[PDB]
Each structure stands twice: as structure tokens, then as C-alpha cells.
A paper describes a structure:
SapB presents a variety of ligands to several lysosomal hydrolases, including arylsulfatase A, β-galactosidase (GLB1), and α-galactosidase A ([name]). One cargo, globotriaosylceramide (Gb3), is presented exclusively by SapB to [name] for removal of the terminal α-galactose, and failure of this process leads to accumulation of Gb3 in the lysosome and ultimately results in Fabry disease.
We determined the structure of SapB bound to [name] at 3.53 Å resolution. One SapB monomer rests asymmetrically across the [name] homodimer, contacting each of the two domains of a [name] monomer. The complex interface contains backbone and side-chain hydrogen bonds and salt bridges, involving Asp231, Asp233, Lys237, Lys240, and Asp244 on [name] and Arg19, His64, Gln66, and Glu69 on SapB. This alignment demonstrated that both a 14° narrowing of the SapB hinge angle and a 19 Å separation of the SapB dimer were necessary to form the SapB pair in the SapB:[name] crystal.
Author numbering:
A (entry chain A): 32 to 426
B (entry chain C): 4 to 78
C (entry chain B): 32 to 427
């Protein structure tokens, strides 16, 4: 979308994978969906360096609404779970230096059953603008025709523009049309800031595998569409949760850095391991994600349960990720000629290679005819940064 | 329900060995495209030349009981 | 098998999941299938307290043999990867106070193309017994018929009885019998110490899911067969590897304690996390698995992505595992009436409940009409031990 926003991929926090639709504040007050949760999250986003690392958008997913609209036809928050209102929450998030997001749907209803924005596009866009909301995650549940889907997404895209407020417009437009339509992503880039491609992520290595395989299969149609202002959204980061190994978390962080992905956390910042915090606040990996050139990486090759991905970086640099997809055994050795990396120009005539994940170490200079050998853990990813001749005469 | 679980464990196990019978399975379903009659046979062969390497990968991540539940044999 | 062995489930160490068939010892000498690996594994099984927990059987899986037999028709190891021989390696294992295991096959070849033992059952049986072998894993790769499979397994059992040495005989009989015929588990219990039922494990949560689902499906066939002497082998333990989370490792340890399963580790003892060491050496969980009553646990309840398993223990004690199979969200609460546990007699009229996994804490006394409430992490398991009115001065 040509709104001057999402020039780098959007970084922040979303509550759906960790907290879901928890409406029981009587028995579980610390985990139900309330403004207390988001205010504690906004405190920890500054107090733990999440704001310093680049995460800024404290977004809200489903199950924030009252079951009915008000007498004026506007959306209203739940009186028990959000008594002080969305606008006061937005002011508290802006007072902490962060930005606040919110959720809505093109359909009659949202995905949980809360009221959607069909027939109320201008009204709800103005409501989120008056509340001070800086990001919209606009879902596509309970939509009856794809014409209604496309017209609702375009109507909200123009209606948020008519508010005059800078907003981030996250779409689920190609999410609910892939079983029966090939999406024309030029339209989706024209009307959205980033778009959800494949199905919803969960706390499993299965979802990481399926999302990466679907992205690598359709990479001829979605890579060149991605740029500053429009990104491919492979849902949320699930690092810091219950159902991923450490190598699988490293795989998700490295491949989200390669795919120019919007790094939306879904964890509990009150209860997070220091290792997941150090992985999610890695400077040299977020720098790959927030590369100012903003060109999405792609799968270079696959075979022998090995995947090699590369992303062009700004300033004659490249980012190379290698995945061992073999889920049996130990650290497997992989050797690749660096003349095949970066269309033959990434190491012409010499490139310095610095491994960033799973550990930060330097691997010395490699000439054009040289071969790079590394060891990759199963269900793990070795991510590396490659320089070129554009370096000082000091080494 | 359970017979599907046995058959899908068999199909998942046979490529867990990395035998590359993916080509044999794609050739088998391309042969099954001739069951549709001469009109839709080459339509099925075009739709099975693409979207078949990726779909078995989604089925390889998927649990066999989940495959039977999603196609309607169990839930 | 009335050999006097495997009265408790067998504890030890196999190599197939972590090291597989690495034969390139020039490029990777530290991680190839050589006697240096097993010597270092025995040294760390003594030095790191793995023996003191209960793991003793340092076993060898496939890819140890020479590509051809010798001039006497006997099996022989690889002369480069095993320069000193199997007998000297077994002496090194016995010098540390451990026991050594080895692998063979009923077919013409093993699963890696190495020579099998079809028509060589007695010869290789006396060869292993003279080398000092205390455990045999017998596979079923490259076997032509079910009659040949059954007769070869019976022949190997009778030959290992004829040697006279105390050898724990592990079989892959119902693993290869199930795709064509319903296995007769009384006969398998008659001839084997423990038998592999489902396919080979890998470093994934999906394999744990499929093994547990298959065990819960066929629990009316294989639970009452299991006792002292005869166990059901799911597969090797994979705790300490690259592909499981902490809660999935907790799930595997608690459920292998519930299922009266053999605890064969398959990891790197040179590189293991302290959390995996503390989980694999949990005294109360191993005491649940090594319970002298020998009755295999069973799935009590399944619903709403929740799984309740229970195992009867000695002294009227019970072990209860609760699994949250929902792989999205945070921890989920679960409340169950304790009168539904242990066929109604586990907490009659009262019971003390002690949580053991994922953390050890005392939950206090619960009556017969009481309801137990708990919270389970996603892909995780809460493991509990319950004692009835068979306790004194611990009741105050
Ligand atoms: C080759 O195969 C044969 C055939 O099975 C094996 O022979 C068996 O060996 C076991 C050895 O453990 C024998 O079992 C033991 O019997 C002892 C008493 O003998 C008699 O006792 C009563 C009648 O008085 C009968 O019920 C019994 O069958 C015998 O007639 C018991 O005291 C032993 O119990 C002790 O060990 C067990 C572990 O097995 C513990 O659980 C107990 O708590 C206790 O400590 C034991 O039960 C069995 O009788 C033999 N059977 C036959 C037919 O000979 C060979 O051992 C085997 N050889 C090799 C090398 O594998
Ligand atoms: C939000 O919901 C409204 C309607 O509300 C819900 O639907 C009703 C069925 C009923 O259950 C209500 O109680 C409930 O709240 C949706 O609006 C409907 O949109 C469809 C679009 O397909 C309209 O159907 C069309 O109506 C035309 C005349 O009004 C008629 O000419 C059309 O017929 C042609 O097309 C059909 C193909 O479906 C074909 O079969 C015919 O032969 C012919 O070619 C067609 O019937 C409904 O009339 C609309 N309902 C109302 C009350 O206006 C709305 O789409 C939905 N929004 C989203 C995003 O899902
Ligand atoms: C509603 O939609 C309209 C589109 O029809 C949109 O108007 C666009 O606004 C952006 C403002 O961000 C304009 O982009 C600028 O164009 C000028 C040239 O005219 C450039 O100088 C600007 O470049 C600077 O800023 C960039 C960051 O955005 C930097 O990357 C750059 O290096 C410079 O520092 C900038 O590109 C754009 O031209 C218009 N488009 C049109 C057709 O007028 C409007 O903003 C939308 N309104 C809302 C509320 O969303
Ligand atoms: C290891 O490899 C050896 C060598 O291949 C193998 O031994 C062979 O087993 C086959 C079993 O099919 C034997 O073939 C049989 O021979 C007898 C005569 O000796 C025939 O009567 C049999 O014919 C009947 O069965 C056929 C089906 O197989 C029918 O088609 C036919 O009409 C008859 O009903 C049968 O041909 C063969 O003789 C041996 N060879 C030797 C040298 O022993 C052994 O089985 C392999 N072991 C394992 C574990 O796989
Ligand atoms: C996606 O669809 C749109 C149509 O909605 C295509 O845009 C059209 O491009 C032609 C260029 O020849 C223009 O004349 C039309 O005016 C455009 N339509 C609109 C509504 O503006 C677009 O080309 C399609 N994307 C791709 C990649 O083909
Ligand atoms: C299983 O084997 C035992 C002894 O070998 C025998 O008594 C029993 O009848 C067999 N079961 C069946 C179903 O034949």
C-alpha cells in the first residue's frame, strides 16, 4: 500500500497464538483477554528492550469486542474486560512510545463470532481512527462470496485512507481464497500493507514446515511482489512457547529474517526464557529482517532433506540460510560452492562470511572458487551474512 | 476411520525411507486421471502435474489420523 | 521368556536415532560408528551417574559388521572402525560394571545391507555368547515369508537359551508381522524379553504422537500381555536431541514410565543439556517405570484434546499421566474426579497425590469424592503418583 508505512517489515506483538479467545476472567484473570494484559505487555515491551530491539506495534487480535454494537452503530469494547475503553489504552500505548493495533473482519461476523464490519466499513474505519489505532488486522471470516471479500478489503483500504490517520493495514485477503483462486497479488499490494498467505500458525514444528514449504512452492508469484510498503505475512512468531525445540525456534527466526516477514511475537512477556529473549532480540538477524532494500528472499535449492535459501541485502551483502530438514540423526555436514550464492556476484572475487545463527562467529574470507562447509543440526537452520569487496583495506 | 489410518501410515512410511516413489505415486494418480473420461483426463493430468509435490508435503507433515479426520473418514 | 532377565523394564543406551550409520570416520571421527564412541559412552555412563540411575545396557544397533563373513562362517566387526574386536569392547564395558548389547537380523541381510543371520542362527548365537554379549536386538529386514520370520525368531530364542549365557533377547517380531497378520502375543511373550510393536522413532513430536495413539488404540491386545519378563518396546528414548521441546520430552518420559517401556537412550552423552540429564535421571519417574508389579499402564480417557493414562503400581499406588494434545494456546486447566481413577479403588477413601512432572510438588490429600484440578502445558504432560491408606507417619 502507498501510505508511506511498512517501509521495513512491521515488528510487534499479537496475542492470538499464546492467549487465544480466553473470556474467563473470573477463573483466569492473568490470562484472559483484557486491557490489563496489554498494559502489562506494554510495560514489558519497554522494560525488557522489546521497544529497543524494534518491536513497536502492540496489536490486538480477536475477542476484544462487546457482543453487540452500541445504539449509534459503532463498535464498542467489552465492558467487563475493557472498561476504560480502547482510546485510553491507545493513549497509554502511545505514552510508552509504542503503537497499538486492533482486529476486525470483512464478514458478517469475526472468526470467533464477534460482530464484523460488513456494511460498516466507513464507520468502523472512523471509529479506529478516533480511538488512535495505528494498525488494523482485517480478517476474512464468514464471507459468502469472493467479490464481497475483494470489495470489502478495497472499501476498508480506501475508508482508512479517508480518515487521514497513518494506519497499518494487515490483510487476510489471499488467506481465504487460495483453495479456489490464484491471487493477483498486484491488487493486494495496491490495497494492503501486508497480507496473510497461508493458514494460521500454531505452537508446532508442523506449521513451520508447512508454511515454509508453501512459501517455497509459490515463490515465483509472491517474492517480487514483496517490497517496501508491501510484505508477505507468514503469521506470528511462536518463539518463547511450549511446542517448539530450540533448533526449530532458530529455524523460524532465521527464515522470518530471510522472507522479510513481519515479526509479530505471540508469547507471554511476563514468562519468557532468557534464551528466547536473546534469540528474538538478535541485532544482526533483525537487521536482515529490517534491511532497507526490502527484497524478499527465496529458496535457492532443495534436496537430500536440505534447503538453501538466500536473501539479497543492502550494500553488496547477502544472507544465506541452510536448513537440515532430516528429522533423524545428528549434525549433518553440508558443502556448497559460494560461486552459486547470490547469482555469482556475492563472492566475486572474495566474500567474508559471518555466521549469525545458531551462534555468532566469523568464518573468514572465501574466494570465488572456494567451497563453504558447515554443520547443521536436525530441524535447525544455520544463518550467515556475506559481505563483498566493499570493505576496508584493513582485512 | 482406522483403515484410513493404517493406509496413510503406510504411504507416509514409504517416503519416510526417501525411496523417491513420489514419481511412482504421481504416475499412479496420473493413471487414475483416466477414470474421469476422455474429457476431464488431461484436465486432471494438468492439475496433477502441478500442486502434487506440495500437497504430499502438507500430507507428510500432517498426522495420519488428522488426514482421515480432515477428509471426513473420522471427524 | 523365563530366562530370569527383564523382570523390570530394560534400561540402557542405543545409537540408531542419534548416530545412525555414519561410516565416514575420516571426515567425522567423533560421530562415526566406531568402538571409540562406545568406549566414551561407557565412560560417561559411569562418570555422569547414568549407571546409578539404572541405565546399564550399552547396546550396538546396525552398521557394526564386516561386509563379508570370515573363513569360519562367523560374524566379524569392521576391521577399521573396530580394530580390537567385539570381545575386547565387551571386556571394556564389563570393566566399568555395565552390560553390552549387539544387533542382528533374522533375514538374509540387515536393514543397512550388512549380512544377516538366516541359516546362521546358532553360529552367530555362540559367537555373541563367546564375545560377551548380554543383549541382542533381532530385526526382521529382508525376510521373505512369515513362516521364515516366526521360525527364525523361535530358532534364535532356542539357540540363545542353548548357549547358557544370560542374554536379554529383544525382538522385532510383531513389528514385521503386523502388516500381514495379527500377531499372537502369547507366543511372542514365550520367546522374547521385549518386542518392538510400532515403526522406528525419529526426533519429532509427530512420532511420539503416532506411537502413543497406536498404543492407545491396540491397548486391549498388548497391555495384559506385559508383565515381568515380557515388555512392549515402543522405541528408543530421544530426550536430549534436537527436535523436541521441553514439554514434549516431559511427555515422552512420563508416558514411557506409564507404559512400562524399555528406557533405551539414543542421544549424545558427550553433549547433553542439564535439563535432559535431570529428566532422564528422575528418581521417582524411573521408580514408576521400574515398578516391581510390572503391569503396563493404559489410556483411561481421551477427549477435548486431553489424554488421561494410568498405571497400577506396587503397594496399591497409582501413576496418572495427563496430556494436553492441543498444540495452540497457553496452559489448559483440567479437572477430573479422583473416584474415576484406578478402577474406583485408588483413592478410597482418601489418597495423597504427589506431582512428579514437569515439577515435583505435593498436592495434598484428596478424598474419594474430591475433584483434582490441574493445569497442563501444550504438548506437555502432568505426571502424578497416588497413594491410598497404606501409609503411616507420612500421613502427618
Ligand atoms: C532356558 O529356558 C528355560 C525354560 O524356561 C529356563 O529355565 C527356567 O529358569 C528360571 C530361572 O529364573 C526358573 O525360574 C525360577 O524357579 C525357581 C523355583 O523353581 C521351581 O519353583 C516352583 C515349584 O517349587 C515352580 O513354580 C518353578 O517353575 C520351578 O519348578 C524360583 O524360585 C525363581 O524365582 C526367582 O526368580 C524370579 C525371576 O524369574 C523372581 O521374580 C523371583 O522373585 C525369585 O527371585 C524362578 O521363578 C524356571 O523354573 C526354569 N524353567 C524351566 C522349565 O526349567 C532357563 O533359565 C533358560 N536358560 C537360559 C540360559 O536362558
Ligand atoms: C452478510 O449477510 C448478508 C445477509 O444476511 C444473512 O443472510 C441471509 C441469507 C439470512 O440468513 C439473514 O438472516 C442473514 O443475516 C449477505 O447479503 C446477502 O448477499 C447475497 C449475495 O449472494 C444476496 O443474494 C442475492 O440476492 C439477489 C437479490 O437480493 C439475487 O438476485 C441473487 O440471486 C442470484 O445469485 C445467486 C447466487 O447466490 C443465484 O443462485 C441466483 O440464481 C441469481 O443468479 C442472490 O440470491 C442476499 O440477498 C443478501 N442478503 C440480504 C439480506 O441482502 C452478505 O453477503 C453478508 N456479508 C458477507 C461479507 O458475507
Ligand atoms: C492515501 O493514499 C494516497 C495514495 O493515493 C497517499 O498518498 C501518498 O503519500 C505518500 C506519503 O508517504 C507519498 O509519498 C511521498 O512522495 C514524495 C514525492 O511526492 C516523496 O518526496 C516522499 O519520499 C520521502 O518519504 C519516504 C517515506 O515515505 C522516504 O522513503 C523517502 O526517502 C523520502 O524521505 C514520499 O515517497 C505518495 O507520493 C502519495 N501518493 C500519491 C499518489 O499522492 C496518502 O498518504 C494516503 N493517506 C493515508 C492517510 O493513508
Ligand atoms: C535368502 O535368499 C535365499 C535365496 O534366494 C532364499 O532361499 C530360497 O527361498 C525360496 C522361497 O520361495 C525357495 O523357493 C522354493 O523352492 C522350492 C523347492 O526347493 C519350491 O517348491 C517352491 O515353490 C513353491 O513356492 C513358490 C512361491 O515361492 C510357488 O510359486 C510355487 O508354485 C511352489 O508353490 C519355491 O520356489 C528357494 O528354493 C530357496 N533357495 C535356496 C538356495 O535356499 C531364502 O528364503 C532367503 N531368506 C530370507 C529370510 O529371505
Ligand atoms: C490484477 O488485476 C488488475 C485488474 O483489477 C490488473 O490491472 C489492470 O491493468 C491494465 C493494464 O493493461 C489496466 O489497463 C487496467 O486499468 C488495470 N485495472 C485496474 C482496475 O486498474 C492487473 O494487471 C492485474 N495484475 C497482473 C499482475 O496482471
Ligand atoms: C498363541 O500361542 C500359544 C502357545 O504358542 C497358543 O496356546 C495359543 O492358542 C496361540 N493363539 C492362537 C490364537 O492360536
Amino acid at each position: 500500500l502507498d501510505n508511506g508505512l511498512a517501509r521495513t517489515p512491521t515488528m510487534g506483538w499479537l496475542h492470538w497464538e499464546r492467549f487465544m479467545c480466553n473470556l474467563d476472567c473470573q477463573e483466569e484473570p492473568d490470562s484472559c483477554i483484557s486491557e490489563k494484559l496489554f498494559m502489562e505487555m506494554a510495560e514489558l515491551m519497554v522494560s525488557e528492550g522489546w521497544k529497543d530491539a524494534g518491536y513497536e506495534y502492540l496489536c490486538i487480535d480477536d475477542c476484544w469486542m462487546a457482543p453487540q454494537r452500541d445504539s449509534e452503530g459503532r463498535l464498542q469494547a467489552d465492558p467487563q474486560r475493557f472498561p476504560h475503553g480502547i482510546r485510553q489504552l491507545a493513549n497509554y500505548v502511545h505514552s510508552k512510545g509504542l503503537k497499538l493495533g486492533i482486529y476486525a473482519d470483512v464478514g458478517n461476523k469475526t472468526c470467533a463470532g464477534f460482530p464484523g464490519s460488513f456494511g460498516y466499513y466507513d464507520i468502523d474505519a472512523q471509529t479506529f481512527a478516533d480511538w488512535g489505532v495505528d494498525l488494523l488486522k482485517f480478517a476474512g471470516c464468514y464471507c459468502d462470496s469472493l467479490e464481497n471479500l475483494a470489495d470489502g478489503y478495497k472499501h476498508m483500504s480506501l475508508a482508512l485512507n479517508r480518515t487521514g490517520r497513518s494506519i497499518v493495514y494487515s490483510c487476510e485477503w489471499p488467506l481465504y481464497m487460495w483453495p479456489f483462486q490464484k491471487p493477483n497479488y498486484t491488487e493486494i499490494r495496491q490495497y494492503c500493507n501486508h497480507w496473510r498467505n497461508f493458514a494460521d500458525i500454531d505452537d508446532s514444528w508442523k506449521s513451520i514446515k508447512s508454511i515454509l514449504d508453501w512459501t517455497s512452492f509459490n515463490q515465483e508469484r509472491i517474492v517480487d511482489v514483496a517490497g517496501p510498503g508491501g510484505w508477505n505475512d507468514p503469521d506470528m512468531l511462536v518463539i518463547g512457547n511450549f511446542g517448539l525445540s530450540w533448533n526449530q525456534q532458530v529455524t523460524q527466526m532465521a527464515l522470518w529474517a530471510i522472507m522479510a516477514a513481519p515479526l509479530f511475537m505471540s508469547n507471554d512477556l511476563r514468562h519468557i526464557s532468557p534464551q528466547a529473549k536473546a534469540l528474538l532480540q538478535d541485532k544482526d538477524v533483525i537487521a536482515i529482517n529490517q534491511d532497507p532494500l526490502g527484497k524478499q528472499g527465496y529458496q535457492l535449492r532443495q534436496g537430500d532433506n536440505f534447503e538453501v535459501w538466500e536473501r539479497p541485502l543492502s550494500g553488496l551483502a547477502w544472507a544465506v540460510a541452510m536448513i537440515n530438514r532430516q528429522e533423524i540423526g545428528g549434525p549433518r555436514s553440508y558443502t556448497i560452492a559460494v560461486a552459486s550464492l547470490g547469482k555469482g556476484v556475492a563472492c566475486n572475487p572474495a566474500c567474508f562470511i559471518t555466521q549469525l545463527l545458531p551462534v555468532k562467529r566469523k568464518l573468514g574470507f572465501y574466494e570465488w572458487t572456494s567451497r563453504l562447509r558447515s554443520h547443521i543440526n536436525p530441524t535447525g537452520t544455520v544463518l550467515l551474512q556475506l559481505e563483498n569487496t566493499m570493505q576496508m583495506s584493513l582485512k | 476411520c482406522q483403515d484410513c489410518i493404517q493406509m496413510v501410515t503406510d504411504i507416509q512410511t514409504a517416503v519416510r525411507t526417501n525411496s523417491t516413489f513420489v514419481q511412482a505415486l504421481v504416475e499412479h494418480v496420473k493413471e487414475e486421471c483416466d477414470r474421469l473420461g476422455p474429457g476431464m483426463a488431461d484436465i486432471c493430468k494438468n492439475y496433477i502435474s502441478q500442486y502434487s509435490e506440495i500437497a504430499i508435503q502438507m500430507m507428510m507433515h500432517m498426522q495420519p489420523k488428522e488426514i482421515c479426520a480432515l477428509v471426513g473418514f473420522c471427524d
